[PDB]
Amino acid sequence: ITNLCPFGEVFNATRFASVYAWNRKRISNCVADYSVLYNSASFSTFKCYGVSPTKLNDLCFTNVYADSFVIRGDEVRQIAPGQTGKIADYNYKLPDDFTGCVIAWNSNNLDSKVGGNYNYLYRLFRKSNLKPFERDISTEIYQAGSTPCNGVEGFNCYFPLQSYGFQPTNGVGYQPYRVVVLSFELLHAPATVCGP
Amino acid sequence: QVQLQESGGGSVQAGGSLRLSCTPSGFTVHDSDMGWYRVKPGNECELVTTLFGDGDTYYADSVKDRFIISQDNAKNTVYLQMNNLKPEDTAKYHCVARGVGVYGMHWFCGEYNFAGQGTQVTVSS
Numbered sequence: 017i018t019n020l021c022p023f024g025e026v027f028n029a030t031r032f033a034s035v036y037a038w039n040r041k042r043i044s045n046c047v048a049d050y051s052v053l054y055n056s057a058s059f060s061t062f063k064c065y066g067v068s069p070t071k072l073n074d075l076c077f078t079n080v081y082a083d084s085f086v087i088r089g090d091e092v093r094q095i096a097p098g099q100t101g102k103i104a105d106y107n108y109k110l111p112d113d114f115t116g117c118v119i120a121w122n123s124n125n126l127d128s129k130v131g132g133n134y135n136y137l138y139r140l141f142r143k144s145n146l147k148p149f150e151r152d153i154s155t156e157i158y159q160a161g162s163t164p165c166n167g168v169e170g171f172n173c174y175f176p177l178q179s180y181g182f183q184p185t186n187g188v189g190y191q192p193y194r195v196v197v198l199s200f201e202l203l204h205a206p207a208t209v210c211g212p
Numbered sequence: 213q214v215q216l217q218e219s220g221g222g223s224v225q226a227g228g229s230l231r232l233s234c235t236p237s238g239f240t241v242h243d244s245d246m247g248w249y250r251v252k253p254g255n256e257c258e259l260v261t262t263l264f265g266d267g268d269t270y271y272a273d274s275v276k277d278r279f280i281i282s283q284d285n286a287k288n289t290v291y292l293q294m295n296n297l298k299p300e301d302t303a304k305y306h307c308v309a310r311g312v313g314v315y316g317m318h319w320f321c322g323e324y325n326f327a328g329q330g331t332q333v334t335v336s337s
């Protein structure tokens with residue numbers, strides 16, 4: 017464990033995932049300075065659960081996972097234990113007993129465009145809610161009624177994904193926010209990601 | 213089945229006006245942000261306008277204040293009022309549902325967008 021953990025490729029990526037197809041990166045065999053991130057004035061959300069951020073430099077884990085995606089600013093509240101709404105329900109679900117940190121910052125300057133950027137998607141329809149940390153990238157037509165759809169969109173036959181419309185003069189609740197979720201995994205197995 | 217029913221184009225003298233009407237079939241104007249592209253001579257695509265969810269509007273700099281987008285939810289219709297037309301406005305105008313939505317994942321002018329056949333507009337000297 018001499019390498020510095022490769023967080024820059026996650027936090028500084030040019031393009032982020034759509035939330036329905038959220039990205040996961042395993043972090044291992046490296047030294048992470050969590051305090052430097054935490055004492056970054058770069059984040060408007062930095063919320064930890066089951067761990068102290070001011071103590072994370074003291075701890076070793078087996079693996080760390082860094083999940084990332086874009087959502088609306090008024091949806092960042094959903095990326096926490098115990099939440100409901102279309103993001104928690106059908107896109108990205110934390111467990112009630114989550115151990116980890118939720119990090120977010122406004123990305124209007126990168127992710128909005130004049131005329132609207134519609135390349136970021138979310139799942140609007142699903143027969144049931146996601147379980148914690150589930151990922152669903154399927155695109156089957158959602159049968160909202162009792163008539164079958166036969167692969168054709170129409171009345172009560174919905175393609176299940178929807179674009180966000182991010183344009184620069186949106187109010188801040190409708191602006192894009194980049195999110196990184198750090199989860200901390202301790203197995204009965206060596207422990208490869210340490211603080212300094 | 214999903215489609216756009218488009219009307220109101222054709223031929224007009226410079227300085228005249230037209231009004232385009234666009235009515236989705238199999239979905240509604242509430243489902244996505246509505247707008248128009250236009251395909252100018254040379255297969256030159258340009259975003260003309262969009263009515264965003266929040267009620268704000270985008271216009272291309274060359275059409276601002278001459279063209280007005282409006283929407284009547286009860287009629288499931290979006291409108292493009294085209295005043296004081298100019299020869300350089302000549303194009304095939306395409307109503308769009310911007311982005312991905314209940315009508316599917318489609319493309320127009322290189323981006324996510326659901327279009328249909330469009331309406332030619334020809335502005336003479």
Ligand SMILES: *[C@@H]1O[C@H](CO)[C@@H](O)[C@H](O)[C@H]1NC(C)=O
Nearest residue numbers: 022023024025026027028053
């Ligand atoms: C991302 O880039 C900024 C700008 O140079 C840098 O200061 C920051 O530390 C980077 N973030 C991470 C996680 O390395």
Ligand code: NA
Nearest residue numbers: 241242244245
């Ligand atoms: Na709309």
